[PDB]
């Protein structure tokens, strides 16, 4: 499979799936930014994003069978749903409460610390994605 990517928006600090890269530019600080096209979406969404900070290989869904590779301290992309918006943003696993289950569905409860505002939330596997490698 080909490398796929996600990019961090400087508007909301959330990660979004990238369809294609249109162009690049060098700020007079020497810092590299690329123009990205976002997945399944209008083209006023196009954004300049920093290459090193805001572009990375796409996050990976975790099957119930592999819920055991997610440990504490681990970095995850977490589906954060709040007062009317739902963003995918970084968080780290503070605690894991293992449940009894099988291949079909995971019922483990992961307590996550969101990186930005530092709030916390308890997520299930169905709402997180792991980092490659
Ligand atoms: O590693 C990370 C690294 O941190 C990050 O800078 C890097 O940015 C990914 C750069 C991708 C540039 C883009 C690739 C598709 C079309 C050509 C231009 O992503 C790496 C993963 O391949
Ligand atoms: Zn589990």
Swiss-Prot record:
Statement: the UniProt record of this protein carries the keyword Metal-binding: yes
Keyword Cytoplasm: no
Subcellular location: Nucleus
GO CC term (a single one): nucleus
Outcome of mutating residue 41 to A: Loss of interaction with H3K9 and strong DNA methylation defects
Residues annotated as binding Zn(2+): 67, 101, 106, 108
Major place of residence: nucleus
Phenotypic effect of disruption: Loss of DRM2 controlled DNA methylation, but no effect on CMT3 or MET1 controlled methylation.
Location of the region described as SAWADEE domain in the Swiss-Prot/TrEMBL record: 14-120
Record keywords: Metal-binding, Nucleus, Zinc
Entry's Gene Ontology BP terms: DNA methylation-dependent constitutive heterochromatin formation; regulatory ncRNA-mediated gene silencing
Domain-related comment: The SAWADEE domain (138-244) binds to mono-, di-, or trimethylated H3K9 histone peptides, but this interaction is impaired if H3K4me2/3 methylation is present.
Function: Involved in RNA-directed DNA methylation (RdDM). Required for the silencing of some endogenous RdDM targets and accumulation of 24-nt siRNAs, but not for the production of Pol V-dependent transcripts. Functions in transcriptional silencing through both DNA methylation-dependent and -independent pathways. Required for both maintenance and de-novo DNA methylation. Plays a role in the recruitment of Pol IV to genomic regions associated with K9 methylated histone H3 that are targets for RdDM.
Protein known as: Protein SAWADEE HOMEODOMAIN HOMOLOG 1
Organism: Arabidopsis thaliana (Mouse-ear cress)
Gene from which the chain derives: SHH1
